Amino acid sequence: ARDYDHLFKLLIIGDSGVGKSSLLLRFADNTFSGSYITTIGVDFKIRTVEINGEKVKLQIWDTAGLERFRTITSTYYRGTHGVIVVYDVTSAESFVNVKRWLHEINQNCDDVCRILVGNKNDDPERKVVETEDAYKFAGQMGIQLFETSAKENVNVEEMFNCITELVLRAKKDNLAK
Amino acid sequence: NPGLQLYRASYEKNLPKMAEALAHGADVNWANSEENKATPLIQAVLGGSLVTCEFLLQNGANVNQRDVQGRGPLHHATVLGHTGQVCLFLKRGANQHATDEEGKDPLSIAVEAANADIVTLLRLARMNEEMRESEDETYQDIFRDFSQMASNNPEKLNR
Numbered sequence: 001a002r003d004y005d006h007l008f009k010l011l012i013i014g015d016s017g018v019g020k021s022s023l024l025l026r027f028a029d030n031t032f033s034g035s036y037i038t039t040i041g042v043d044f045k046i047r048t049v050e051i052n053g054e055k056v057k058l059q060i061w062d063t064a065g066l067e068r069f070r071t072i073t074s075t076y077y078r079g080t081h082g083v084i085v086v087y088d089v090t091s092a093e094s095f096v097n098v099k100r101w102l103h104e105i106n107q108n109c110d111d112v113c114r115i116l117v118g119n120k121n122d123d124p125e126r127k128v129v130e131t132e133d134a135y136k137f138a139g140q141m142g143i144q145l146f147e148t149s150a151k152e153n154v155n156v157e158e159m160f161n162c163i164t165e166l167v168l169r170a171k172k173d174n175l176a177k
Numbered sequence: 178n179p180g181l182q183l184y185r186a187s188y189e190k191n192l193p194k195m196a197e198a199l200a201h202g203a204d205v206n207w208a209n210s211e212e213n214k215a216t217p218l219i220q221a222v223l224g225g226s227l228v229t230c231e232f233l234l235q236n237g238a239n240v241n242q243r244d245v246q247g248r249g250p251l252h253h254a255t256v257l258g259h260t261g262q263v264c265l266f267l268k269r270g271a272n273q274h275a276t277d278e279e280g281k282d283p284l285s286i287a288v289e290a291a292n293a294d295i296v297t298l299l300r301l302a303r304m305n306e307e308m309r310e311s312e313d314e315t316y317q318d319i320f321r322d323f324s325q326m327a328s329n330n331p332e333k334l335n336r
């Protein structure tokens with residue numbers, strides 16, 4: 001018996017600059033700074049949500065995207081229930097690299113929920129990863145995709161609620177009727 | 178001057194001489210008024226030895242006691258990149274929120290140094306603080322996280 005009814009670890013991964021920390025701050029504090037502060041090692045937020053009469057505590061880990069500033073890889077993945085994989089819809093490279101991030105998950109995790117996030121969807125003139133192409137890819141991987149803007153606060157709450165429900169469902173599907 | 182003998186032997190990783198100083202009545206928390214009120218445990222940090230830090234803590238050293246610039250053992254270990262000493266101090270209840278007289282805490286120092294390993298230990302220890310404050314799945318094993326990190330960085334200015 002604890003303060004929460006369920007505890008889940010969520011891990012945010014993806015290339016440097018794509019908006020991982022910004023998505024986390026928007027969800028956690030409803031703020032967006034506009035400034036870029038490079039994540040060194042790891043950062044985190046702990047937040048609770050109420051779902052179907054139960055308190056769910058989210059321990060949300062935020063990785064450094066730059067290899068130079070990452071710690072030992074197994075530290076990020078250990079105990080993870082859900083992984084949030086982020087690219088930047090204005091950066092083709094960040095989307096190309098999604099398959100590398102998916103490989104990293106597979107080398108470190110046996111059985112986790114996943115969600116794909118195309119962030120910075122707030123400037124049509126600089127968008128290079130088209131919605132349809134991203135959804136097609138997501139479909140082939142069997143993973144849900146959300147296109148978000150941490151800056152404009154679009155689909156951030158929806159994305160975090162989705163991966164929360166996925167991990168809750170994964171847990172409950174293994175418990176009694 | 179048994180305190181001074183202990184102080185010197187701590188830098189020098191000399192546990193028998195440390196023990197001898199203690200047997201003669203050295204204060205394990207002796208402050209050297211001639212050298213910024215630094216302590217045996219701060220000397221142990223500067224000397225780079227983990228086992229010397231352990232010995233002092235086992236014999237009653239205050240893990241938080243500061244020099245005259247307001248810098249404790251954890252501050253100094255962070256500045257020198259002594260990852261193993263940072264891990265030990267965090268597990269022994271060191272106050273990582275302490276700021277020195279210039280207003281800096283260990284996390285700000287580690288972030289400015291872009292030190293992934295030490296930032297990771299400091300942040301995961303904070304996560305444990307936050308998990309506890311709301312009141313193992315709830316408890317990060319930072320030793321396990323430390324166990325495959327480098328114990329130090331010899332390219333950093335240190336011994």
Ligand SMILES: Nc1nc2c(ncn2[C@@H]2O[C@H](COP(=O)(O)OP(=O)(O)OP(=O)(O)O)[C@@H](O)[C@H]2O)c(=O)[nH]1
Pocket residue numbers: 014015016017018019020021022023033034035036037038039040063064065066119120121122148149150151152
């Ligand atoms: N236009 C726009 N910019 C964004 C958005 N989200 C983040 N940014 C900007 O993108 C830059 C990088 O944001 P971060 O959240 O720090 O990126 P990150 O993935 O955490 O980067 P690393 O910590 O280096 O791995 C910052 O300048 C942000 O203000 C967004 O939704 N739209």
Ligand SMILES: [Mg+2]
Pocket residue numbers: 020021022037038039062063064065
């Ligand atoms: Mg970041």
